[PDB]
Design a protein around this ligand. Structure first.
Ligand SMILES: CCCCCCCCCCCCCC(=O)CSCCNC(=O)CCNC(=O)[C@H](O)C(C)(C)COP(=O)(O)OP(=O)(O)OC[C@H]1O[C@@H](n2cnc3c(N)ncnc32)[C@H](O)[C@@H]1OP(=O)(O)O
Ligand SMILES: Cc1cc(F)ccc1-c1ccc2[nH]nc(CN(C)C)c2c1
Ligand SMILES: CCOC(=O)c1c(C)nc2ccccc2c1C
Ligand SMILES: [Cl-]
Ligand SMILES: [Mg+2]
Length: 385
C-alpha cells in the first residue's frame, strides 16, 4: 500500500530485487555514540514500562495483554494463547536484556496496553554470521489500533537495540511488509479430527463421512525409531553437533551455542518438546515441537485448540517421512489436537504422504537493515516463535 512508516526505514522498497552476490547492510558504519539517548515520545497519558518477565505478576500482565489482543487468523475463529510459562522461555534465552522487553502503560488505569520484545541471536544469512535482534510479540490493545503506536514501539526498540551496537534484526509476520526475504505457507495435520470438525475447521462430505475422516487420520501408536526419548541435560552436546551441522546447508539459520541449545531444547511441559535417538552415546536423530494453543472465539463446546508447532527435526538413521510421522505420534501422545508445520527446510516433501492439508496463508520472513536476494522457503532454516 503506501508504507509511509516502512519506507523511512533501512528495508528494501516493494520493487527491490537483489542479485545473489549482494549480502550487506543498507546502512553500514553505524556509531553507538550517535544513537539517541532519549525515549521516543508516547501520546499524552501513556508511559514506557520496563517489564520484568521473571516476575510472575509483570509476566502475567504481558500474558493478559496477548491473550486478549494478539494475532487472530484471517477469519477471527482463533487467537494465539501463548502461555505465561512459554513467554518466560521465549524471552529469557542466553544474554537476554530485560531492557528489550518494552511495555506501554495507560497512566490513569496503570494497565499494560502495548508491548514489543527482542532477544539477541547470531543469524547466518547467505553464509555471513551477523549478531541480530529477534523481534517478537509486538502488540497494541484492540481499543487503540490504527493510531500509529506500532511505529513508536518499533522505533523505541530499534533505539535500544542500537545502544548495544546491534544494527540488524530478524522478524516474521503473516502480513505483507517491505519486503520478505522468504515466504512460507503453513500446513496442518489433523490429530483430533472430531474436535476440528466441530469448531468449523475441517470439512466433511458424501465421500468423507465423520467415521471415514476419523479412520483417515488414525495413527499407529508405535514409533518408527523405537528409542526416541525426551531430551535430557546429558544430550546437549550431541544435539548441538547434530543440529549445528544440519543447519549449515540453509540460506538463513541461527548459529546456536551450547547454552542456546540447552535453553531452546531441554524439555519443558506445555512449552517445548524435544526427543532424541541415542546410539553409542551419540545423538543420531532429533524431533522438536513447541506448544502454542489457540483460543477458540465463540464456540459453545470448546475454548482452546491445543496445537504442536514443528520446530527443528533432523534424521540420520531413518527417512525424513518416518521422522515426521514419529513427530506426529509424539504430539498425539501428548494430547495435541493438530500438528502445524511451515514449508521450510525439508518439510514440504512430507506433507502429502503424511496427510497435511494446505492452510489459508503464509508466514513471511523479514530482515531489518539487510540487503540480499530472496529465496524459496526450502532454503529457510530458522523457525521463530
Ligand atoms: C536493528 C534493530 C531493529 C529492530 C526493529 C526490527 C523491525 C521489527 C518490526 C516489528 C516486528 C513485529 C513481529 C511480531 O511481533 C510477530 S508478527 C505479530 C504482530 N502482532 C500482531 O499481529 C497482534 C495483533 N495486532 C496488533 O497488535 C496491531 O495490529 C499491531 C501492533 C501489529 C499494529 O498496530 P496497528 O494499531 O494495527 O497499526 P499502527 O500502530 O497504526 O501502525 C501502522 C504501521 O505498522 C505497520 N505494521 C502493522 N503490522 C505490523 C507487523 N506485524 N510488523 C511490523 N509492522 C507492522 C503497518 O505496516 C504500518 O506501517 P506503514 O504505514 O509503513 O504500512
Ligand atoms: C498458523 C501458523 C502455522 C505454522 F505451522 C507456523 C506459523 C503460523 C503462524 C501464522 C501467522 C503468524 N503471525 N504471527 C505468528 C507468530 N510468529 C511466528 C511470529 C504467526 C504464526
Ligand atoms: C487448525 C489450527 O491451525 C490454524 O488454523 C490456526 C490457529 C489454531 N490459530 C491461529 C492463530 C492466529 C493466526 C492464524 C492461526 C491459524 C491458521
Ligand atoms: Cl522519528
Ligand atoms: Mg495504534
Amino acid at each position: 500500500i503506501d508504507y509511509k512508516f516502512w519506507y523511512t526505514q533501512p528495508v528494501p522498497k516493494i520493487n527491490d530485487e537483489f542479485n545473489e552476490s549482494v549480502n550487506e547492510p543498507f546502512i553500514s558504519d553505524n556509531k553507538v555514540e550517535d544513537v539517541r539517548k532519549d525515549e521516543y515520545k508516547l501520546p499524552p497519558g501513556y508511559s514506557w514500562y520496563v517489564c520484568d518477565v521473571k516476575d510472575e505478576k509483570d509476566r502475567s500482565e504481558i500474558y493478559t495483554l496477548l491473550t486478549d489482543n494478539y494475532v487472530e487468523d484471517d477469519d477471527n475463529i482463533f487467537r494465539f494463547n501463548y502461555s505465561a510459562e512459554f513467554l518466560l522461555w521465549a524471552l529469557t534465552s542466553p544474554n537476554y536484556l530485560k531492557t528489550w522487553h518494552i511495555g506501554v502503560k495507560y497512566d490513569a488505569s496503570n494497565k499494560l496496553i502495548g508491548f514489543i520484545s527482542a532477544i539477541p541471536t547470531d543469524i547466518c544469512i547467505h553464509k555471513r554470521t551477523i549478531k541480530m535482534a529477534e523481534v517478537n510479540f509486538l502488540c497494541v490493545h484492540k481499543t487503540l489500533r490504527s493510531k500509529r503506536l506500532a511505529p513508536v514501539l518499533i522505533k523505541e526498540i530499534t533505539r535500544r537495540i542500537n545502544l548495544e551496537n546491534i544494527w540488524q534484526a530478524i522478524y516474521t509476520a503473516g502480513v505483507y511488509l517491505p519486503k520478505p526475504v522468504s515466504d512460507a505457507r503453513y500446513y496442518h495435520r489433523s490429530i483430533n479430527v472430531k474436535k476440528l470438525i466441530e469448531i468449523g475447521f475441517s470439512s466433511l462430505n458424501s465421500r468423507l463421512t465423520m467415521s471415514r475422516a476419523i479412520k483417515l487420520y488414525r495413527v499407529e501408536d508405535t514409533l518408527n525409531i523405537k528409542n526416541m526419548r525426551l531430551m535430557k541435560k546429558k544430550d546437549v552436546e550431541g544435539v548441538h553437533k547434530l543440529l549445528g551441522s544440519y543447519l549449515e546447508q540453509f540460506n538463513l539459520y541461527a548459529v546456536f551455542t551450547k547454552e542456546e541449545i540447552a535453553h531452546w531444547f531441554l524439555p519443558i511441559e506445555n512449552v517445548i518438546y524435544t526427543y532424541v535417538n541415542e546410539e553409542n552415546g551419540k545423538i543420531k536423530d532429533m524431533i522438536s515441537f513447541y506448544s502454542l494453543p489457540s483460543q477458540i472465539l465463540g464456540n459453545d463446546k470448546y475454548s482452546t485448540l491445543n496445537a504442536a508447532y514443528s520446530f527443528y527435526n533432523v534424521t540420520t538413521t531413518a527417512t525424513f517421512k518416518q521422522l515426521m510421522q514419529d513427530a506426529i505420534l509424539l504430539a498425539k501422545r501428548n494430547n495435541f489436537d493438530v500438528f502445524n508445520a511451515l514449508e521450510v527446510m525439508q518439510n514440504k516433501s512430507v506433507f502429502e504422504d503424511l496427510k497435511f492439508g494446505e492452510g489459508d496463508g503464509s508466514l513471511k520472513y523479514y530482515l531489518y537493515n539487510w540487503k540480499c536476494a530472496s529465496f524459496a522457503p526450502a532454503h529457510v532454516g530458522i523457525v521463530l516463535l
